[PDB]
Structures are given as C-alpha cells and as structure tokens.
C-alpha cells in the first residue's frame, strides 16, 4: 500500500523550526512561527497560567470526560471575551460554544460542518493570508477563492481591490474575516471599514467566518473584538474560530473554541447538535487541561487581573520591538525606508523582502523569515536586534 | 444558512450521559459509557498521574509548540508498549508514532490519511463494534462494510462466520481488528486464531489497521498485545490506533497515539510525511499535558511501577465485579444462567438484553446501559449491586 505514496512539501511554517534545530552557529535568530519571547529570548509559561495549574493540581478529583463541546464556564467565558458581557446574542442565547484543540481545530470542526449540513461549497480567502488556511478547508472538501487585500505597493489595505474582488463572492458562501492583527500582513480594517463589510456581507448574503486568534495583541480585549461585534449587530449566522494559544501563551495545550452563532436559540440548538456530531467524529471530546487554566483564570478576578497585566506586558514589548527594529534599520543604513512596520498589528511584519533575500539571510547568515518575507518581531530582543539588522541591510 | 439542518440523533454513548445528568432519584445507576470506577463508584485521577503532574508543574518552562507528530518520548515508549522492547521493528526503524489526542483522533488521522494517500475506499468492522468506528471512516469518505464475529446464540467468537464473512474483503482493503477487549463483546481470539487471521491477512493482501485502546484490561500489557504482535510479525505495513485513555484513567486529557509501520524507513518516512500533513490541516499539533504525564511516567521505573500496579489493580477489581454480578443475578433468581459474562474481557459485559428491556431498565429503575444491551461492569460496585440484580431480573 504505501511504496508510491509521495513526500508532502514542508509546511511554510512548521517546517522552518526543523532547519532551526539542525543549524549550528551559535548566532542563528528565529524569526519564523509566531511565538512570544521575551526580553531574554524564552517563551515562558506565564504566571497567572502556573498559579491556574496549581489550583487545578490540587483541587481536581477525576480525568473523566469532558463531553463533545467541553467545559461550560469555558463557552460561557470566550462568548463574553469575544462578543461583550451585555450582549444581546448571550442574552438571547443565539449563540453555541465547542472547546477545541486550538484555533486550527476550531476552523477544521467549522469547515466540517459546514461541508456536511449546508449548501456552502466555496470559502473566501484573503491574498494573501495563513498558509494553513488553505489546507483547512480544502480538507473538508471547500474550495477556497482569494480575495485583495494589501497594497504591497503602498503598504495599505486596498479597500477597492478588496470590495471589487469580493463582488465575485456568491450569496451562500463564505467570507474568512482576521479579527486583528491580520497574518500575515498587521493590517486591519477600521471600524468604519468592518461596518461598511458588515453592510455589504447582509446585502450580500456571504455567512462571515472569523478567525480570531490574536484578541489582545492589537489593541486591546474590548478593542480589538469591534470588527467581530459590529458584524454581530448586523448578521444572523456567523461562525468565529477563536484560540488562546498566543493571549493566554497555552500554544501547545491546544485551546480554543469554535462558536456558531443563528438567529435563535432552537436554531443554533439544531445547528449545534451537528457540529458537535462532526467533532465526536473527529477527536470525540476537548483535552481538559489547557481550557480547564482558561476557565479559571477568567472566571477569578485575581488571577484575570494578573494575566490582563501580563497580556498588555506582552503587547507592549512586541511594539517596543517594532519601534526599536525600524530605528536600527535605519542607524544600519538601510536604502529602503521601512516607516511602515510601525503602522502593523500583532506580532509579524510584512517586511517586503524577496524569496531570494529571506534565501540568502537562512544561509549566509542563519536568520530565520517565513518565505512571505512574514518576520516575527515578538521574537526580536534588544540583543539580537543588531546582528539581525546587520544581516538584513548586507541583503537588501 | 442554518435554518434547514436537522438535528443530529444522540449519540448511542455520550448522549447516555444526558439523561443520567437530567435523571433525579438518587438510586440511578450508570452502566453507560466504559469509565472504570472504584469500589465508592468514582473515577479517581490516579497516583502516578498526580505525582507526574507535580514533577510538570514545577520542571516545565514553557508551553511552546509540539510539532505535528508531538513529543519523541511519548513515541518511542508507545512503540516498546505495543511492539515489544527488543523489536524489529523498532531497531529497523519501520515504526512512526503522531501522538493524537485521544484514540479517536488517531482512528481519524489514520481515516484521513488512507483517504487522501492510499487506493482504499472501503474499511471492514466487526458486527458488531464501538459505534463510533463507522461514522470516522465514513467523515474521511470511506465506506464501512461489516464482518461476523459474535456468535449471540452461544456467546463465542463465531471464527468460521468470522473468516467466510471476510472472504468478500478485498486485496488492498483495510480489516479494524479490535486489539484486546472487544467492544462491545469481551471476546477476543485466541492465540492461535490471531495467527491465523495473520496468516490469512498476508495471504489477502488486507492492510490491518488495530483499535487498542485496552492495553492492559485483560490479562496485561505484554499479554494483550500478542495478537497485535503476531500481525507485526507476517505484515511489512500496519497501523494501530492506541488510547491512554482507560489505562492511565487520562479521559478527558486525549492521549492516543497513531503508529504507521511500513517495510523500510524510507518509505514510513515517506508515509509518514503525508500523515503528517493531514494532522496540520486538522488541529494542527498535539495537547501536550496528558502525554507528557504518560511520558514521564513511562520514563521512571518508580513513577512505572507504581502506575502498573495501579493498572492491574483496575483490572483486577473490574474482574471481581463480574465475578460479583453473575453470582447476585443468580441469587436474585434469574431464569437465563449468565456464566458467559465470566468469560469476557475489559470493562463491559454483552448481556443479552433486549433493546426493550434496556429501556425500560432506564425508565422504571433508573439504570442506564448502552440499546446494545453492553453493560459497563467497571462502573458496578459492592453497594449498587443488589439493585442492578434486582432490575435486571424484574425485566427478563
Ligand atoms: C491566523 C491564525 N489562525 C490560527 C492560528 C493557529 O492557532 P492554534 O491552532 O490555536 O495554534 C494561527 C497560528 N499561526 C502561527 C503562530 C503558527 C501556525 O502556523 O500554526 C504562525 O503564523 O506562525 C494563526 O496565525
Ligand atoms: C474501541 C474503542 N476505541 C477507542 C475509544 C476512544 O478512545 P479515546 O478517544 O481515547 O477516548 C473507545 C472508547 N469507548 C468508550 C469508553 C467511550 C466512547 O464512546 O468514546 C465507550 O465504549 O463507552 C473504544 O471503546
């Protein structure tokens, strides 16, 4: 059976921390998959997340299953993370909540759900965007379309380019909306912009997917969740695949969530009930312990107020990084003017470098860029920002 | 978009535990989903597991991401469990392990994979097994056909309606063997009989793909993983589908692992890529708290001794409760005998109840079993058990 299967290409972004592992030199800089460091270069585990663990340590009596959409004070938590403690759709119950092994597992139950009890067959994109986007949905059997988006040129969002490309988009399908700090370009839409989307998308008929995996990093909490709100004072359905991975630094416990969102409760109920059918085909149930950290930091004041600080620590230092990164580029000389990156969201820059020139700066200089050119400033430390400069400037 | 769907039907298992939630009179009794319990009827983290959850709270230093197989320890010992210490297949280095979450992730990830890199479209299942195998297969797109396996009538594994049922399976299909304590039947082959069914595999040109998520429930570790043994023996590729589910009492934290076994390195390498991408494109990497329990439990001889009396101490009790339960049925008069039970393997028993009367054993005295008429003996204890005989004989 397997003597002709064939060897995947590596994954963009994944596959970049394998040549990290196998490069000696002790100079290698590691500005590929999107992970916090701090000042020092580490990803710790963060405080308010080991005093959670601790609580649960001691006072949990059973591994006993957790049942297909996962633990309640969870649901109940992201639902007012991401749509407002006062909302009308909590209120109303229009809303459903399954805990998922992260974000991506959250858009793969999403796209399953939606090849299998709805009419959709076509999933919007955006040019460009996460890599595994892509993978996601065309495994569920979706074909994916792309959309405008950035201004390379300029550096902007092309609103036009974008409205004119969506025009081609079918009532009944889906439009894949970044909630902030789009990946991998930093730009996003301003409330004037996401409601004049939010406008076009009933008029239009497209069912609104968010992918929100970075609530906290753009602005803030309340902040950054504006798009997604006025787009739920506007629909009936929505569907957003949110994770913690990043805001609560849990990447490898695999948290997050996949909300459906109808336009009552017996609705979304008869919704629901297919959702979690194509999750108890996939995984069966949510691993307990990253979402169990999740729940209790939010549902404690103490601990929300240390890990709220904690988060805005994390926010701060990565734009520390991207102020200090353009200065540097420019005291090393650089021939480009590269005032944009200040102008970007959440922990990437678009930098505009070449495939040749991210190439070059792997092999002669053991700097690590996605292929996009995508840069990971939370991984820039004042320590390596002048050998990183210095080997971007020899490439330019 | 959602106003047409329908509403999935309950689950068989899971949506059991719906009405035990919903059910008040405090003499319910729950013989449902396949938990063991303790002699006080709770499901306790185990000891071993709490100590390896110390040792990770205060060693780990980051939550960083895994990487799509997960983490190499977890692997190599999942390898020794189910292959043998001192294998070939592990010194040719034929085996790969992606750690999963759960058993059910890896029967999906195996379905995926098949699917999208293999000429199989059809997988055959026991009549009967565990519900949820077709609807994986059938997620993925293959096609479930079934083959003879119990013999009701006399409570045997029926081997010739086993062997004349799979003569229709054709050379490059998949046959799910169960590895040890079939679900929902406890009978299991023989030694002898598996060598057959291996030998009559190669003959076949079958691809075996083994569920083992019993290790260990019915007569020990080495012992239950002969017959999956004898298949590595006679096959050059295979894959096994295992759960630390139930030995580790870890239910909630998903930790199954995917083996795929090919004739060389090269090509399981080769393979391995593919199931590798299949993984990104579902929930990306593995949830690394409940492995790393079983990893740095697998790795001490203590924390390993202590959990391996934990285990059979499970298997032991399991096996006094239904030692226990066909002697109270038979003091409570019964008309049928039910020796059989005694015959059985892990946790649950096949009754021989009707649909009807598992009905009305829900309805009139509060106990819950699966239609099938399986019944969970690991969730009986000294104290429930002259009510459940009591129900039971008021109903045959
Ligand atoms: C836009 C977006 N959505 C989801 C995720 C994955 O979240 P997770 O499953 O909760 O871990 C990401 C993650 N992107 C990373 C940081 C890592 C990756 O490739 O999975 C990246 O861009 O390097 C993003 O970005
Ligand atoms: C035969 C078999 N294979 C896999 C699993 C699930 O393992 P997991 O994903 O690691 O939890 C099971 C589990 N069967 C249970 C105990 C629960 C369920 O329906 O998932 C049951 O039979 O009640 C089995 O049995």
Same mark, same amino acid.
């Given at each position: 059976?397997?003597?002709?299967?064939?060897?995947?290409?590596?994954?963009?972004? #994944?596959?970049?921390?394998?040549?990290?592992? !196998?490069?000696?030199?002790?100079?290698?800089?590691?500005?590929?998959?999107?992970?916090?460091?701090?000042?020092?270069?580490?990803?710790?585990?963060?405080?308010?997340?080991?005093?959670?663990?601790?609580?649960?340590?001691? +006072?949990?009596?059973?591994?006993?299953?957790?049942?297909?959409?996962?633990?309640?004070?969870?649901?109940?938590?992201?639902?007012?993370? @991401?749509?407002?403690?006062?909302?009308?759709?909590?209120?109303?119950?229009?809303?459903?909540?399954?805990?998922?092994?992260?974000?991506?597992?959250?858009?793969?139950?999403?796209?399953?759900?939606?090849?299998?009890?709805?009419?959709?067959?076509?999933?919007?994109?955006?040019?460009?965007?996460?890599?595994?986007?892509?993978?996601?949905?065309?495994?569920?059997?979706?074909?994916?379309?792309?959309?405008?988006?950035?201004?390379?040129?300029?550096?902007?969002?092309?609103?036009?380019?974008?409205?004119?490309?969506?025009?081609?988009?079918?009532?009944?399908?889906?439009?894949?909306?970044?909630?902030?700090?789009?990946?991998?370009?930093?730009?996003?839409?301003?409330?004037?912009?996401?409601?004049? #989307?939010?406008?076009?998308?009933?008029?239009?008929?497209?069912?609104?997917?968010?992918?929100?995996?970075?609530?906290?990093?753009?602005?803030? @909490?309340?902040?950054?969740?504006?798009? #997604?709100?006025?787009?739920?004072?506007?629909?009936?359905?929505?569907?957003?695949?949110?994770?913690?991975?990043?805001?609560?630094?849990?990447? +490898?416990?695999?948290?997050?969530?996949?909300?459906?969102?109808?336009?009552?409760?017996?609705?979304?109920?008869?919704?629901?009930?297919?959702?979690?059918?194509?999750?108890?085909?996939?995984?069966?149930?949510?691993?307990?312990?990253?979402?169990?950290?999740? !729940?209790?930091?939010?549902?404690?004041? !103490?601990?929300?107020?240390?890990?709220?600080?904690?988060?805005?620590?994390?926010?701060?230092?990565?734009?520390?990084?991207?102020?200090?990164?353009?200065?540097?580029?420019?005291?090393?000389?650089?021939?480009?003017?590269?005032?944009?990156?200040?102008?970007?969201?959440?922990?990437?820059?678009?930098?505009?470098?070449?495939?040749?020139?991210?190439?070059?700066?792997?092999?002669?200089?053991?700097?690590?860029?996605?292929?996009?050119?995508?840069?990971?400033?939370?991984?820039?430390?004042?320590?390596?920002?002048?050998?990183?400069?210095?080997?971007?400037?020899?490439?330019?």
């Amino acid at each position: 059976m397997f003597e002709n299967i064939t060897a995947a290409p590596a994954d963009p972004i #994944l596959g970049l921390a394998d040549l990290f592992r !196998a490069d000696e030199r002790p100079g290698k800089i590691n500005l590929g998959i999107g992970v916090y460091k701090d000042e020092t270069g580490k990803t710790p585990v963060l405080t308010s997340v080991k005093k959670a663990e601790q609580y649960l340590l001691e +006072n949990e009596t059973t591994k006993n299953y957790l049942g297909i959409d996962g633990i309640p004070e969870f649901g109940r938590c992201t639902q007012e993370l @991401l749509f407002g403690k006062g909302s009308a759709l909590i209120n109303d119950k229009r809303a459903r909540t399954a805990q998922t092994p992260g974000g991506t597992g959250a858009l793969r139950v999403a796209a399953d759900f939606l090849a299998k009890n709805t009419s959709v067959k076509r999933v919007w994109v955006s040019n460009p965007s996460w890599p595994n986007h892509k993978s996601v949905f065309n495994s569920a059997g979706l074909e994916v379309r792309e959309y405008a988006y950035y201004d390379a040129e300029n550096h902007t969002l092309d609103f036009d380019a974008l409205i004119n490309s969506l025009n081609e988009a079918q009532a009944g399908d889906v439009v894949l909306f970044h909630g902030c700090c789009h990946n991998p370009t930093g730009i996003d839409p301003t409330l004037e912009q996401w409601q004049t #989307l939010a406008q076009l998308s009933v008029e239009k008929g497209w069912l609104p997917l968010f992918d929100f995996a970075y609530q906290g990093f753009a602005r803030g @909490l309340e902040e950054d969740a504006e798009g #997604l709100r006025a787009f739920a004072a506007m629909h009936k359905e929505l569907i957003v695949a949110s994770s913690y991975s990043k805001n609560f630094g849990l990447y +490898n416990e695999r948290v997050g969530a996949c909300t459906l969102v109808a336009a009552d409760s017996e609705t979304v109920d008869r919704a629901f009930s297919q959702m979690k059918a194509a999750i108890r085909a996939n995984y069966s149930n949510p691993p307990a312990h990253g979402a169990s950290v999740v !729940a209790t930091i939010l549902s404690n004041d !103490a601990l929300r107020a240390i890990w709220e600080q904690e988060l805005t620590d994390m926010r701060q230092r990565i734009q520390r990084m991207r102020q200090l990164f353009v200065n540097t580029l420019q005291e090393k000389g650089a021939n480009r003017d590269f005032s944009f990156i200040i102008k970007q969201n959440g922990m990437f820059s678009f930098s505009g470098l070449t495939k040749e020139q991210v190439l070059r700066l792997r092999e002669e200089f053991g700097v690590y860029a996605v292929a996009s050119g995508r840069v990971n400033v939370a991984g820039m430390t004042p320590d390596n920002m002048a050998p990183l400069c210095e080997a971007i400037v020899a490439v330019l």
